[PDB]
């Protein structure tokens, strides 16, 4: 499961 990264 990917770590969340905001943009």
């Amino acid at each position, epitope marked *: *499961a*990917e*770590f*969340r*990264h*905001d*943009s």
Partner: antibody, heavy 124, light 113 residues
Framework: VTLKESGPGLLKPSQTLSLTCSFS??????????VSWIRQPSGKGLEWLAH???????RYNPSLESRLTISKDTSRDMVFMKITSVDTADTATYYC?????????????????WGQGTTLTVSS | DVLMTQTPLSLPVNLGEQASISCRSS???????????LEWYLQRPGQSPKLLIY???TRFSGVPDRFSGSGSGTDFTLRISRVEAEDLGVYYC?????????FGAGTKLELKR
């Protein structure tokens, strides 16, 4: 920018660890930085525990997740960690780490500031 | 989960020599957003970990240009061109693309004798 961890120093096995990380020199609210807890058990390397985003979304390391609760109070510029049912293996230094970035590149984030840590020894 | 394997785990050097540390992830750590979240941290003896390199090859502010990060996908290298006394300590590679975020075991850069 400074980060300061606080913790009880010593606990008995089965107690709940309550950690605080207090931030100075910027605003959690305004910066929208994410924050992690990372620990270094006695004689071991670093292990990531948990992370909380600006909107209170959370992620955990499955190896310990069932025992972990991360939370924050933006109005106090604080992030917290609870670890239930401590035992000897929880003897470690606990670090708070800021997942900062250079504005406004939210996607280019990394652990830019770490505190001094708080050490815990667990013993009966 | 992603295993981060550093080689070697102990790296004795003479001050002034080059140093090289390899990090292999067990799967690709290219994130769906396009970035590869590979970071290098140094923990000097008796100090807190500090960021050296992020996004594989970008030095964090204040980090000397004798440090260089390279690699792609699963295959990463930290190079130090000329080791100085302040460089000795334990180096960790770290991936923040997949949960759990994971560190390597650490490579101790130590003085040779």
């Amino acid at each position: 920018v400074t980060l300061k961890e606080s913790g009880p120093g010593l606990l008995k096995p089965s107690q709940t660890l309550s950690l605080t990380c207090s931030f100075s020199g910027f605003s959690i609210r305004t910066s929208k930085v994410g924050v992690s807890w990372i620990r270094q058990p006695s004689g071991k390397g670093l292990e990531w525990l948990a992370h909380i985003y600006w909107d209170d979304d959370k992620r955990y390391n499955p190896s310990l997740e069932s025992r972990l609760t991360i939370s924050k109070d933006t109005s106090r510029d604080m992030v917290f960690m609870k670890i239930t049912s401590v035992d000897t293996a929880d003897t470690a230094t606990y670090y708070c780490a800021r997942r900062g970035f250079y504005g406004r590149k939210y996607e280019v984030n990394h652990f830019d500031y770490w505190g001094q840590g708080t050490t815990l020894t667990v013993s009966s | 989960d992603v295993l981060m394997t550093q080689t070697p785990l102990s790296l004795p050097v003479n001050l002034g020599e080059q140093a090289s540390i390899s990090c292999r992830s067990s799967q690709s750590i290219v994130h769906s957003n396009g970035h590869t979240y590979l970071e290098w941290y140094l923990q000097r003896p008796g100090q807190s970990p500090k960021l050296l390199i992020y996004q594989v090859s970008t030095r964090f502010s204040g980090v000397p240009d004798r440090f260089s990060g390279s690699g792609s996908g699963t295959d990463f290298t930290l190079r130090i061109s000329r080791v100085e006394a302040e460089d000795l300590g334990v180096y960790y590679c770290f991936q923040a693309s997949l949960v759990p975020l994971t560190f390597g075991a650490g490579t101790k850069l130590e003085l040779k004798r």
